[PDB]
């Protein structure tokens, strides 16, 4: 560290953000711009590389599937490169959107204005909350691409407050497993901090997939005593043999019957771990919970990834910075 600040070199969240700066060709900037909703957010799943300009819209914005957070970083970079203030304006509306979406607790919902159901929860899914906070933190700290006149000091204060609140949320939400600090569910109650379900097959759990990005975000923050403890505990969880499955890997090509296959000297992480036992588990469209992936419907076993190499990146990064 330096002071209490870790390097951003190798930080997964920082890598995501810097990549987003050039997510699309600059030739697509007007197309991207044209789908921004009135509220400053974007809808998800628009094929910007193929579609012509949109007509804006008045729908909820979302941070699912990289929406809003990717577009805003991209357009900030376009503003930085070309100086066209229409893009500055859009980035300002997008940052405002993210902060406006934030609950009093710091939680960020998946969709805003709130649509009801699981979308209202604090959404770590698809790196939404963690990477949204990363964007706001980069903005707050005048990091590229936000080292332009896009934001003022007063704006940065507001973003710092949102980042602080988000951090507070994350720290309060971090799951204490029989007294031991671990990681996060893919979604938590915005007000109650509790693990929540999402889709039918997304149950209350520790998330092997989403907890990486949460840790990566925390590692961008001033490493207070509490934050260092939180990060070290999360990294320790990823690096624990009670968490990874040693000698196996997840091979989605083999999912027809069983994608969890032996691989000497490999470690696999589950997508879902039981909150209390730390056992990897599976679900299905009926919302059931079970421990043998061969019991799952063919469609869910092949159509959704139930494990992966999630821990490698954060463990290696933690090692690099002395947190392992």
PDB file of C-alpha atoms in Angstrom:
ATOM      1  CA  UNK A   1       0.000   0.000   0.000  1.00  0.00           C
ATOM      2  CA  UNK A   2       0.831   3.621   0.024  1.00  0.00           C
ATOM      3  CA  UNK A   3      -0.588   5.452   2.912  1.00  0.00           C
ATOM      4  CA  UNK A   4      -3.845   3.548   2.932  1.00  0.00           C
ATOM      5  CA  UNK A   5      -4.244   3.389  -0.921  1.00  0.00           C
ATOM      6  CA  UNK A   6      -3.702   0.215  -2.929  1.00  0.00           C
ATOM      7  CA  UNK A   7      -2.500   0.169  -6.499  1.00  0.00           C
ATOM      8  CA  UNK A   8      -5.159   0.150  -9.182  1.00  0.00           C
ATOM      9  CA  UNK A   9      -2.796  -1.877 -11.377  1.00  0.00           C
ATOM     10  CA  UNK A  10      -4.449  -5.288 -11.705  1.00  0.00           C
ATOM     11  CA  UNK A  11      -7.647  -4.233  -9.960  1.00  0.00           C
ATOM     12  CA  UNK A  12     -10.518  -5.973 -11.774  1.00  0.00           C
ATOM     13  CA  UNK A  13     -12.918  -3.054 -11.350  1.00  0.00           C
ATOM     14  CA  UNK A  14     -10.368  -0.547 -12.611  1.00  0.00           C
ATOM     15  CA  UNK A  15      -9.607  -2.866 -15.534  1.00  0.00           C
ATOM     16  CA  UNK A  16     -13.309  -3.007 -16.350  1.00  0.00           C
ATOM     17  CA  UNK A  17     -13.622   0.781 -16.260  1.00  0.00           C
ATOM     18  CA  UNK A  18     -10.586   1.456 -18.374  1.00  0.00           C
ATOM     19  CA  UNK A  19     -11.814  -1.064 -20.936  1.00  0.00           C
ATOM     20  CA  UNK A  20     -15.233   0.607 -21.003  1.00  0.00           C
ATOM     21  CA  UNK A  21     -13.591   3.843 -22.141  1.00  0.00           C
ATOM     22  CA  UNK A  22     -13.319   2.273 -25.594  1.00  0.00           C
ATOM     23  CA  UNK A  23     -16.156  -0.260 -25.409  1.00  0.00           C
ATOM     24  CA  UNK A  24     -17.456   0.848 -28.804  1.00  0.00           C
ATOM     25  CA  UNK A  25     -15.852   2.678 -31.668  1.00  0.00           C
ATOM     26  CA  UNK A  26     -16.090   6.447 -31.257  1.00  0.00           C
ATOM     27  CA  UNK A  27     -18.224   6.302 -34.434  1.00  0.00           C
ATOM     28  CA  UNK A  28     -20.991   4.897 -32.188  1.00  0.00           C
ATOM     29  CA  UNK A  29     -21.000   7.769 -29.703  1.00  0.00           C
ATOM     30  CA  UNK A  30     -24.083   9.435 -31.181  1.00  0.00           C
ATOM     31  CA  UNK A  31     -25.920   6.124 -31.321  1.00  0.00           C
ATOM     32  CA  UNK A  32     -25.073   5.426 -27.681  1.00  0.00           C
ATOM     33  CA  UNK A  33     -26.000   8.949 -26.719  1.00  0.00           C
ATOM     34  CA  UNK A  34     -29.343   8.661 -28.490  1.00  0.00           C
ATOM     35  CA  UNK A  35     -30.568   5.813 -26.246  1.00  0.00           C
ATOM     36  CA  UNK A  36     -29.997   7.612 -22.966  1.00  0.00           C
ATOM     37  CA  UNK A  37     -33.280   7.885 -21.122  1.00  0.00           C
ATOM     38  CA  UNK A  38     -34.595  11.155 -19.746  1.00  0.00           C
ATOM     39  CA  UNK A  39     -33.538  10.090 -16.269  1.00  0.00           C
ATOM     40  CA  UNK A  40     -29.918   9.754 -17.413  1.00  0.00           C
ATOM     41  CA  UNK A  41     -29.755   5.975 -17.324  1.00  0.00           C
ATOM     42  CA  UNK A  42     -29.721   3.570 -20.227  1.00  0.00           C
ATOM     43  CA  UNK A  43     -31.852   0.539 -20.937  1.00  0.00           C
ATOM     44  CA  UNK A  44     -30.001  -2.750 -21.271  1.00  0.00           C
ATOM     45  CA  UNK A  45     -29.265  -5.008 -24.224  1.00  0.00           C
ATOM     46  CA  UNK A  46     -29.218  -2.432 -27.023  1.00  0.00           C
ATOM     47  CA  UNK A  47     -27.047  -3.496 -29.972  1.00  0.00           C
ATOM     48  CA  UNK A  48     -25.200  -0.197 -30.454  1.00  0.00           C
ATOM     49  CA  UNK A  49     -22.934  -1.648 -33.119  1.00  0.00           C
ATOM     50  CA  UNK A  50     -25.904  -2.419 -35.380  1.00  0.00           C
ATOM     51  CA  UNK A  51     -28.741  -0.015 -34.580  1.00  0.00           C
ATOM     52  CA  UNK A  52     -29.351   3.510 -35.773  1.00  0.00           C
ATOM     53  CA  UNK A  53     -30.074   6.345 -33.401  1.00  0.00           C
ATOM     54  CA  UNK A  54     -32.795   5.970 -30.835  1.00  0.00           C
ATOM     55  CA  UNK A  55     -35.334   8.413 -29.508  1.00  0.00           C
ATOM     56  CA  UNK A  56     -34.208   8.505 -25.929  1.00  0.00           C
ATOM     57  CA  UNK A  57     -37.060   7.376 -23.766  1.00  0.00           C
ATOM     58  CA  UNK A  58     -38.704   7.647 -20.393  1.00  0.00           C
ATOM     59  CA  UNK A  59     -38.111   4.167 -19.068  1.00  0.00           C
ATOM     60  CA  UNK A  60     -36.168   3.173 -16.014  1.00  0.00           C
ATOM     61  CA  UNK A  61     -32.428   3.075 -16.375  1.00  0.00           C
ATOM     62  CA  UNK A  62     -30.532  -0.006 -15.403  1.00  0.00           C
ATOM     63  CA  UNK A  63     -27.120  -1.148 -14.286  1.00  0.00           C
ATOM     64  CA  UNK A  64     -27.767  -4.707 -15.414  1.00  0.00           C
ATOM     65  CA  UNK A  65     -25.611  -6.186 -18.164  1.00  0.00           C
ATOM     66  CA  UNK A  66     -23.173  -3.260 -17.936  1.00  0.00           C
ATOM     67  CA  UNK A  67     -25.857  -0.748 -18.810  1.00  0.00           C
ATOM     68  CA  UNK A  68     -25.471   2.907 -17.859  1.00  0.00           C
ATOM     69  CA  UNK A  69     -22.084   2.390 -16.260  1.00  0.00           C
ATOM     70  CA  UNK A  70     -20.450   1.367 -19.533  1.00  0.00           C
ATOM     71  CA  UNK A  71     -22.149   4.021 -21.659  1.00  0.00           C
ATOM     72  CA  UNK A  72     -21.245   6.809 -19.255  1.00  0.00           C
ATOM     73  CA  UNK A  73     -17.568   5.849 -19.051  1.00  0.00           C
ATOM     74  CA  UNK A  74     -17.450   5.571 -22.831  1.00  0.00           C
ATOM     75  CA  UNK A  75     -19.084   8.939 -23.408  1.00  0.00           C
ATOM     76  CA  UNK A  76     -16.844  10.554 -20.796  1.00  0.00           C
ATOM     77  CA  UNK A  77     -13.885   9.327 -22.812  1.00  0.00           C
ATOM     78  CA  UNK A  78     -15.485  10.637 -26.003  1.00  0.00           C
ATOM     79  CA  UNK A  79     -15.943  13.999 -24.303  1.00  0.00           C
ATOM     80  CA  UNK A  80     -12.327  13.925 -23.138  1.00  0.00           C
ATOM     81  CA  UNK A  81     -11.119  13.100 -26.679  1.00  0.00           C
ATOM     82  CA  UNK A  82     -13.302  15.348 -28.821  1.00  0.00           C
ATOM     83  CA  UNK A  83     -14.613  18.088 -26.526  1.00  0.00           C
ATOM     84  CA  UNK A  84     -18.228  17.900 -27.664  1.00  0.00           C
ATOM     85  CA  UNK A  85     -20.282  19.060 -24.676  1.00  0.00           C
ATOM     86  CA  UNK A  86     -23.372  17.055 -25.690  1.00  0.00           C
ATOM     87  CA  UNK A  87     -21.416  14.094 -24.301  1.00  0.00           C
ATOM     88  CA  UNK A  88     -20.442  15.979 -21.151  1.00  0.00           C
ATOM     89  CA  UNK A  89     -24.131  16.674 -20.637  1.00  0.00           C
ATOM     90  CA  UNK A  90     -24.963  12.997 -20.987  1.00  0.00           C
ATOM     91  CA  UNK A  91     -22.278  11.921 -18.559  1.00  0.00           C
ATOM     92  CA  UNK A  92     -23.595  14.428 -16.022  1.00  0.00           C
ATOM     93  CA  UNK A  93     -27.129  13.060 -16.415  1.00  0.00           C
ATOM     94  CA  UNK A  94     -25.814   9.506 -16.017  1.00  0.00           C
ATOM     95  CA  UNK A  95     -23.910  10.292 -12.824  1.00  0.00           C
ATOM     96  CA  UNK A  96     -26.969  12.076 -11.495  1.00  0.00           C
ATOM     97  CA  UNK A  97     -29.017   9.007 -12.369  1.00  0.00           C
ATOM     98  CA  UNK A  98     -26.695   6.721 -10.426  1.00  0.00           C
ATOM     99  CA  UNK A  99     -26.767   8.940  -7.369  1.00  0.00           C
ATOM    100  CA  UNK A 100     -30.528   9.504  -7.637  1.00  0.00           C
ATOM    101  CA  UNK A 101     -31.003   5.742  -7.680  1.00  0.00           C
ATOM    102  CA  UNK A 102     -29.138   5.308  -4.439  1.00  0.00           C
ATOM    103  CA  UNK A 103     -31.082   4.435  -1.341  1.00  0.00           C
ATOM    104  CA  UNK A 104     -30.426   6.189   1.977  1.00  0.00           C
ATOM    105  CA  UNK A 105     -28.403   3.127   2.973  1.00  0.00           C
ATOM    106  CA  UNK A 106     -26.105   3.383  -0.038  1.00  0.00           C
ATOM    107  CA  UNK A 107     -27.654   0.454  -1.911  1.00  0.00           C
ATOM    108  CA  UNK A 108     -27.939   0.734  -5.688  1.00  0.00           C
ATOM    109  CA  UNK A 109     -30.911  -0.978  -7.325  1.00  0.00           C
ATOM    110  CA  UNK A 110     -30.805  -2.825 -10.594  1.00  0.00           C
ATOM    111  CA  UNK A 111     -33.422  -0.592 -12.213  1.00  0.00           C
ATOM    112  CA  UNK A 112     -34.408   2.929 -11.285  1.00  0.00           C
ATOM    113  CA  UNK A 113     -37.034   4.338 -10.896  1.00  0.00           C
ATOM    114  CA  UNK A 114     -37.869   1.218  -8.977  1.00  0.00           C
ATOM    115  CA  UNK A 115     -39.793  -1.391 -10.893  1.00  0.00           C
ATOM    116  CA  UNK A 116     -40.601  -3.649  -7.954  1.00  0.00           C
ATOM    117  CA  UNK A 117     -39.496  -7.156  -7.196  1.00  0.00           C
ATOM    118  CA  UNK A 118     -35.909  -8.237  -6.958  1.00  0.00           C
ATOM    119  CA  UNK A 119     -34.718  -5.435  -9.211  1.00  0.00           C
ATOM    120  CA  UNK A 120     -35.209  -3.061  -6.267  1.00  0.00           C
ATOM    121  CA  UNK A 121     -32.620  -4.882  -4.174  1.00  0.00           C
ATOM    122  CA  UNK A 122     -29.043  -3.752  -3.724  1.00  0.00           C
ATOM    123  CA  UNK A 123     -27.749  -5.437  -6.869  1.00  0.00           C
ATOM    124  CA  UNK A 124     -24.277  -6.834  -6.949  1.00  0.00           C
ATOM    125  CA  UNK A 125     -25.346  -9.057  -9.819  1.00  0.00           C
ATOM    126  CA  UNK A 126     -23.356  -8.558 -12.998  1.00  0.00           C
ATOM    127  CA  UNK A 127     -20.995  -6.315 -11.054  1.00  0.00           C
ATOM    128  CA  UNK A 128     -23.691  -3.657 -11.066  1.00  0.00           C
ATOM    129  CA  UNK A 129     -23.386  -1.966  -7.719  1.00  0.00           C
ATOM    130  CA  UNK A 130     -19.656  -2.493  -7.359  1.00  0.00           C
ATOM    131  CA  UNK A 131     -18.783  -1.164 -10.798  1.00  0.00           C
ATOM    132  CA  UNK A 132     -21.287   1.705 -10.527  1.00  0.00           C
ATOM    133  CA  UNK A 133     -19.557   2.730  -7.320  1.00  0.00           C
ATOM    134  CA  UNK A 134     -16.218   2.371  -9.082  1.00  0.00           C
ATOM    135  CA  UNK A 135     -17.380   4.781 -11.788  1.00  0.00           C
ATOM    136  CA  UNK A 136     -18.570   7.259  -9.165  1.00  0.00           C
ATOM    137  CA  UNK A 137     -15.296   6.856  -7.279  1.00  0.00           C
ATOM    138  CA  UNK A 138     -13.255   7.509 -10.396  1.00  0.00           C
ATOM    139  CA  UNK A 139     -15.437  10.581 -11.030  1.00  0.00           C
ATOM    140  CA  UNK A 140     -15.049  11.707  -7.402  1.00  0.00           C
ATOM    141  CA  UNK A 141     -11.278  11.385  -7.619  1.00  0.00           C
ATOM    142  CA  UNK A 142     -10.884  13.075 -10.971  1.00  0.00           C
ATOM    143  CA  UNK A 143      -9.512   9.895 -12.537  1.00  0.00           C
ATOM    144  CA  UNK A 144      -9.535   9.494 -16.286  1.00  0.00           C
ATOM    145  CA  UNK A 145     -11.808   9.804 -18.128  1.00  0.00           C
ATOM    146  CA  UNK A 146     -13.350  12.186 -15.557  1.00  0.00           C
ATOM    147  CA  UNK A 147     -10.273  14.430 -15.334  1.00  0.00           C
ATOM    148  CA  UNK A 148     -11.974  17.016 -17.537  1.00  0.00           C
ATOM    149  CA  UNK A 149     -14.412  19.796 -16.797  1.00  0.00           C
ATOM    150  CA  UNK A 150     -17.275  17.256 -16.875  1.00  0.00           C
ATOM    151  CA  UNK A 151     -17.602  17.637 -13.117  1.00  0.00           C
ATOM    152  CA  UNK A 152     -17.058  20.347 -10.567  1.00  0.00           C
ATOM    153  CA  UNK A 153     -15.773  20.074  -7.009  1.00  0.00           C
ATOM    154  CA  UNK A 154     -19.383  20.174  -5.781  1.00  0.00           C
ATOM    155  CA  UNK A 155     -20.284  17.292  -8.086  1.00  0.00           C
ATOM    156  CA  UNK A 156     -17.312  15.331  -6.821  1.00  0.00           C
ATOM    157  CA  UNK A 157     -18.453  15.940  -3.246  1.00  0.00           C
ATOM    158  CA  UNK A 158     -21.800  14.435  -4.108  1.00  0.00           C
ATOM    159  CA  UNK A 159     -20.095  11.477  -5.760  1.00  0.00           C
ATOM    160  CA  UNK A 160     -17.771  10.996  -2.814  1.00  0.00           C
ATOM    161  CA  UNK A 161     -20.825  10.926  -0.556  1.00  0.00           C
ATOM    162  CA  UNK A 162     -22.481   8.312  -2.812  1.00  0.00           C
ATOM    163  CA  UNK A 163     -19.294   6.229  -2.823  1.00  0.00           C
ATOM    164  CA  UNK A 164     -19.017   6.510   0.940  1.00  0.00           C
ATOM    165  CA  UNK A 165     -22.618   5.462   1.378  1.00  0.00           C
ATOM    166  CA  UNK A 166     -22.107   2.571  -1.032  1.00  0.00           C
ATOM    167  CA  UNK A 167     -19.058   1.484   0.872  1.00  0.00           C
ATOM    168  CA  UNK A 168     -20.946   1.691   4.135  1.00  0.00           C
ATOM    169  CA  UNK A 169     -23.671  -0.464   2.588  1.00  0.00           C
ATOM    170  CA  UNK A 170     -21.178  -3.063   1.418  1.00  0.00           C
ATOM    171  CA  UNK A 171     -19.542  -3.253   4.821  1.00  0.00           C
ATOM    172  CA  UNK A 172     -22.904  -3.654   6.593  1.00  0.00           C
ATOM    173  CA  UNK A 173     -24.072  -6.245   4.065  1.00  0.00           C
ATOM    174  CA  UNK A 174     -20.987  -8.422   4.246  1.00  0.00           C
ATOM    175  CA  UNK A 175     -22.176 -11.745   5.564  1.00  0.00           C
ATOM    176  CA  UNK A 176     -21.131 -12.992   8.971  1.00  0.00           C
ATOM    177  CA  UNK A 177     -21.109 -16.717   8.751  1.00  0.00           C
ATOM    178  CA  UNK A 178     -21.411 -17.974  12.317  1.00  0.00           C
ATOM    179  CA  UNK A 179     -19.462 -14.980  13.474  1.00  0.00           C
ATOM    180  CA  UNK A 180     -16.883 -14.935  10.636  1.00  0.00           C
ATOM    181  CA  UNK A 181     -16.873 -12.197   7.983  1.00  0.00           C
ATOM    182  CA  UNK A 182     -17.201 -13.642   4.450  1.00  0.00           C
ATOM    183  CA  UNK A 183     -18.621 -12.120   1.262  1.00  0.00           C
ATOM    184  CA  UNK A 184     -21.917 -11.060  -0.307  1.00  0.00           C
ATOM    185  CA  UNK A 185     -24.979 -12.433  -1.986  1.00  0.00           C
ATOM    186  CA  UNK A 186     -25.623 -11.336  -5.544  1.00  0.00           C
ATOM    187  CA  UNK A 187     -28.413  -9.201  -4.147  1.00  0.00           C
ATOM    188  CA  UNK A 188     -29.272  -7.901  -0.678  1.00  0.00           C
ATOM    189  CA  UNK A 189     -32.148  -5.982   0.814  1.00  0.00           C
ATOM    190  CA  UNK A 190     -31.703  -2.307   0.159  1.00  0.00           C
ATOM    191  CA  UNK A 191     -32.983  -1.474   3.629  1.00  0.00           C
ATOM    192  CA  UNK A 192     -32.457  -4.631   5.643  1.00  0.00           C
ATOM    193  CA  UNK A 193     -29.010  -5.652   4.260  1.00  0.00           C
ATOM    194  CA  UNK A 194     -30.127  -9.305   4.197  1.00  0.00           C
ATOM    195  CA  UNK A 195     -29.359 -11.726   1.380  1.00  0.00           C
ATOM    196  CA  UNK A 196     -32.204 -11.974  -1.075  1.00  0.00           C
ATOM    197  CA  UNK A 197     -33.306 -14.102  -3.993  1.00  0.00           C
ATOM    198  CA  UNK A 198     -33.472 -12.790  -7.543  1.00  0.00           C
ATOM    199  CA  UNK A 199     -34.715 -15.008 -10.359  1.00  0.00           C
ATOM    200  CA  UNK A 200     -36.128 -18.395  -9.481  1.00  0.00           C
ATOM    201  CA  UNK A 201     -32.768 -20.144  -9.630  1.00  0.00           C
ATOM    202  CA  UNK A 202     -30.888 -17.341  -7.830  1.00  0.00           C
ATOM    203  CA  UNK A 203     -31.250 -18.044  -4.144  1.00  0.00           C
ATOM    204  CA  UNK A 204     -29.973 -16.504  -0.961  1.00  0.00           C
ATOM    205  CA  UNK A 205     -26.339 -17.386  -0.830  1.00  0.00           C
ATOM    206  CA  UNK A 206     -22.803 -16.193  -0.863  1.00  0.00           C
ATOM    207  CA  UNK A 207     -21.953 -15.305  -4.423  1.00  0.00           C
ATOM    208  CA  UNK A 208     -18.738 -16.737  -5.740  1.00  0.00           C
ATOM    209  CA  UNK A 209     -19.166 -14.729  -8.938  1.00  0.00           C
ATOM    210  CA  UNK A 210     -20.162 -11.281  -7.711  1.00  0.00           C
ATOM    211  CA  UNK A 211     -18.106 -11.047  -4.568  1.00  0.00           C
ATOM    212  CA  UNK A 212     -14.925 -10.585  -6.647  1.00  0.00           C
ATOM    213  CA  UNK A 213     -16.061  -7.234  -7.972  1.00  0.00           C
ATOM    214  CA  UNK A 214     -17.223  -6.084  -4.558  1.00  0.00           C
ATOM    215  CA  UNK A 215     -13.762  -6.812  -3.176  1.00  0.00           C
ATOM    216  CA  UNK A 216     -12.166  -5.124  -6.155  1.00  0.00           C
ATOM    217  CA  UNK A 217     -14.265  -2.017  -5.503  1.00  0.00           C
ATOM    218  CA  UNK A 218     -13.353  -2.034  -1.813  1.00  0.00           C
ATOM    219  CA  UNK A 219      -9.723  -2.272  -2.802  1.00  0.00           C
ATOM    220  CA  UNK A 220     -10.034   1.063  -4.659  1.00  0.00           C
ATOM    221  CA  UNK A 221     -11.048   2.776  -1.393  1.00  0.00           C
ATOM    222  CA  UNK A 222      -8.933   4.269   1.351  1.00  0.00           C
ATOM    223  CA  UNK A 223      -8.013   1.206   3.362  1.00  0.00           C
ATOM    224  CA  UNK A 224      -9.383   2.086   6.763  1.00  0.00           C
ATOM    225  CA  UNK A 225      -8.974  -0.513   9.504  1.00  0.00           C
ATOM    226  CA  UNK A 226     -12.473  -1.781   8.819  1.00  0.00           C
ATOM    227  CA  UNK A 227     -12.101  -1.855   5.048  1.00  0.00           C
ATOM    228  CA  UNK A 228      -8.811  -3.700   5.217  1.00  0.00           C
ATOM    229  CA  UNK A 229     -10.421  -6.210   7.555  1.00  0.00           C
ATOM    230  CA  UNK A 230     -13.407  -6.601   5.212  1.00  0.00           C
ATOM    231  CA  UNK A 231     -11.234  -7.117   2.176  1.00  0.00           C
ATOM    232  CA  UNK A 232      -8.866  -9.504   3.903  1.00  0.00           C
ATOM    233  CA  UNK A 233     -11.838 -11.514   5.145  1.00  0.00           C
ATOM    234  CA  UNK A 234     -13.402 -11.696   1.692  1.00  0.00           C
ATOM    235  CA  UNK A 235     -10.137 -12.668   0.066  1.00  0.00           C
ATOM    236  CA  UNK A 236      -9.553 -15.266   2.788  1.00  0.00           C
ATOM    237  CA  UNK A 237     -12.984 -16.690   2.018  1.00  0.00           C
ATOM    238  CA  UNK A 238     -12.138 -17.006  -1.659  1.00  0.00           C
ATOM    239  CA  UNK A 239      -8.792 -18.534  -0.752  1.00  0.00           C
ATOM    240  CA  UNK A 240     -10.182 -21.044   1.721  1.00  0.00           C
ATOM    241  CA  UNK A 241     -10.360 -24.743   0.967  1.00  0.00           C
ATOM    242  CA  UNK A 242     -13.789 -24.671   2.606  1.00  0.00           C
ATOM    243  CA  UNK A 243     -14.784 -22.432  -0.339  1.00  0.00           C
ATOM    244  CA  UNK A 244     -12.918 -23.562  -3.407  1.00  0.00           C
ATOM    245  CA  UNK A 245     -13.226 -27.067  -4.726  1.00  0.00           C
ATOM    246  CA  UNK A 246      -9.690 -28.221  -5.301  1.00  0.00           C
ATOM    247  CA  UNK A 247      -8.885 -30.598  -8.129  1.00  0.00           C
ATOM    248  CA  UNK A 248     -11.882 -29.568 -10.259  1.00  0.00           C
ATOM    249  CA  UNK A 249     -12.872 -27.050 -12.855  1.00  0.00           C
ATOM    250  CA  UNK A 250     -16.111 -25.890 -14.400  1.00  0.00           C
ATOM    251  CA  UNK A 251     -16.314 -26.757 -18.070  1.00  0.00           C
ATOM    252  CA  UNK A 252     -19.530 -25.432 -19.565  1.00  0.00           C
ATOM    253  CA  UNK A 253     -18.851 -27.524 -22.711  1.00  0.00           C
ATOM    254  CA  UNK A 254     -19.483 -30.598 -20.556  1.00  0.00           C
ATOM    255  CA  UNK A 255     -22.676 -29.236 -19.010  1.00  0.00           C
ATOM    256  CA  UNK A 256     -24.981 -31.664 -20.858  1.00  0.00           C
ATOM    257  CA  UNK A 257     -24.315 -34.124 -18.065  1.00  0.00           C
ATOM    258  CA  UNK A 258     -21.916 -32.550 -15.569  1.00  0.00           C
ATOM    259  CA  UNK A 259     -19.680 -29.498 -16.075  1.00  0.00           C
ATOM    260  CA  UNK A 260     -17.878 -30.005 -12.779  1.00  0.00           C
ATOM    261  CA  UNK A 261     -14.955 -32.094 -13.831  1.00  0.00           C
ATOM    262  CA  UNK A 262     -11.574 -33.110 -12.472  1.00  0.00           C
ATOM    263  CA  UNK A 263      -8.592 -30.993 -13.353  1.00  0.00           C
ATOM    264  CA  UNK A 264      -5.397 -31.674 -11.435  1.00  0.00           C
ATOM    265  CA  UNK A 265      -4.127 -28.726  -9.449  1.00  0.00           C
ATOM    266  CA  UNK A 266      -7.124 -26.559 -10.387  1.00  0.00           C
ATOM    267  CA  UNK A 267      -9.552 -24.825  -8.062  1.00  0.00           C
ATOM    268  CA  UNK A 268     -13.200 -24.191  -8.824  1.00  0.00           C
ATOM    269  CA  UNK A 269     -15.577 -21.822  -7.133  1.00  0.00           C
ATOM    270  CA  UNK A 270     -19.298 -22.251  -6.974  1.00  0.00           C
ATOM    271  CA  UNK A 271     -21.628 -19.512  -8.080  1.00  0.00           C
ATOM    272  CA  UNK A 272     -23.756 -20.060  -4.968  1.00  0.00           C
ATOM    273  CA  UNK A 273     -22.698 -21.098  -1.495  1.00  0.00           C
ATOM    274  CA  UNK A 274     -24.984 -21.790   1.405  1.00  0.00           C
ATOM    275  CA  UNK A 275     -24.901 -18.833   3.796  1.00  0.00           C
ATOM    276  CA  UNK A 276     -24.280 -20.945   6.864  1.00  0.00           C
ATOM    277  CA  UNK A 277     -22.522 -24.161   5.762  1.00  0.00           C
ATOM    278  CA  UNK A 278     -20.509 -22.664   2.923  1.00  0.00           C
ATOM    279  CA  UNK A 279     -21.552 -25.606   0.738  1.00  0.00           C
ATOM    280  CA  UNK A 280     -21.805 -24.961  -2.963  1.00  0.00           C
ATOM    281  CA  UNK A 281     -25.320 -25.489  -4.235  1.00  0.00           C
ATOM    282  CA  UNK A 282     -27.590 -25.491  -7.207  1.00  0.00           C
ATOM    283  CA  UNK A 283     -31.083 -24.391  -8.025  1.00  0.00           C
ATOM    284  CA  UNK A 284     -33.538 -24.643 -10.876  1.00  0.00           C
ATOM    285  CA  UNK A 285     -36.598 -22.987 -12.341  1.00  0.00           C
ATOM    286  CA  UNK A 286     -38.728 -24.313  -9.483  1.00  0.00           C
ATOM    287  CA  UNK A 287     -36.579 -22.418  -6.992  1.00  0.00           C
ATOM    288  CA  UNK A 288     -35.430 -25.642  -5.318  1.00  0.00           C
ATOM    289  CA  UNK A 289     -32.050 -26.011  -3.685  1.00  0.00           C
ATOM    290  CA  UNK A 290     -29.920 -29.103  -4.056  1.00  0.00           C
ATOM    291  CA  UNK A 291     -26.361 -30.310  -4.000  1.00  0.00           C
ATOM    292  CA  UNK A 292     -25.907 -32.572  -7.035  1.00  0.00           C
ATOM    293  CA  UNK A 293     -25.873 -30.723 -10.328  1.00  0.00           C
ATOM    294  CA  UNK A 294     -27.014 -33.847 -12.193  1.00  0.00           C
ATOM    295  CA  UNK A 295     -30.417 -33.410 -10.486  1.00  0.00           C
ATOM    296  CA  UNK A 296     -30.906 -30.118 -12.332  1.00  0.00           C
ATOM    297  CA  UNK A 297     -33.014 -29.627 -15.434  1.00  0.00           C
ATOM    298  CA  UNK A 298     -30.964 -29.940 -18.582  1.00  0.00           C
ATOM    299  CA  UNK A 299     -31.903 -26.436 -19.631  1.00  0.00           C
ATOM    300  CA  UNK A 300     -30.675 -24.796 -16.418  1.00  0.00           C
ATOM    301  CA  UNK A 301     -27.493 -26.875 -16.242  1.00  0.00           C
ATOM    302  CA  UNK A 302     -26.532 -25.912 -19.788  1.00  0.00           C
ATOM    303  CA  UNK A 303     -28.068 -22.415 -19.820  1.00  0.00           C
ATOM    304  CA  UNK A 304     -26.515 -20.935 -16.694  1.00  0.00           C
ATOM    305  CA  UNK A 305     -23.027 -21.239 -15.226  1.00  0.00           C
ATOM    306  CA  UNK A 306     -23.036 -22.788 -11.753  1.00  0.00           C
ATOM    307  CA  UNK A 307     -19.333 -22.402 -11.052  1.00  0.00           C
ATOM    308  CA  UNK A 308     -16.164 -21.023 -12.439  1.00  0.00           C
ATOM    309  CA  UNK A 309     -12.710 -19.685 -11.926  1.00  0.00           C
ATOM    310  CA  UNK A 310     -13.990 -16.698  -9.990  1.00  0.00           C
ATOM    311  CA  UNK A 311     -11.425 -16.503  -7.228  1.00  0.00           C
ATOM    312  CA  UNK A 312      -8.208 -16.573  -9.270  1.00  0.00           C
ATOM    313  CA  UNK A 313      -8.240 -12.951 -10.244  1.00  0.00           C
ATOM    314  CA  UNK A 314      -8.956 -11.506  -6.805  1.00  0.00           C
ATOM    315  CA  UNK A 315      -6.643 -13.911  -4.993  1.00  0.00           C
ATOM    316  CA  UNK A 316      -3.751 -13.110  -7.286  1.00  0.00           C
ATOM    317  CA  UNK A 317      -4.435  -9.390  -6.982  1.00  0.00           C
ATOM    318  CA  UNK A 318      -4.666  -9.676  -3.205  1.00  0.00           C
ATOM    319  CA  UNK A 319      -1.339 -11.531  -3.216  1.00  0.00           C
ATOM    320  CA  UNK A 320       0.223  -8.741  -5.301  1.00  0.00           C
ATOM    321  CA  UNK A 321      -0.842  -6.079  -2.753  1.00  0.00           C
ATOM    322  CA  UNK A 322      -0.042  -8.141   0.377  1.00  0.00           C
ATOM    323  CA  UNK A 323      -3.624  -9.012   1.391  1.00  0.00           C
ATOM    324  CA  UNK A 324      -3.113 -12.783   1.097  1.00  0.00           C
TER     325      UNK A 324
END
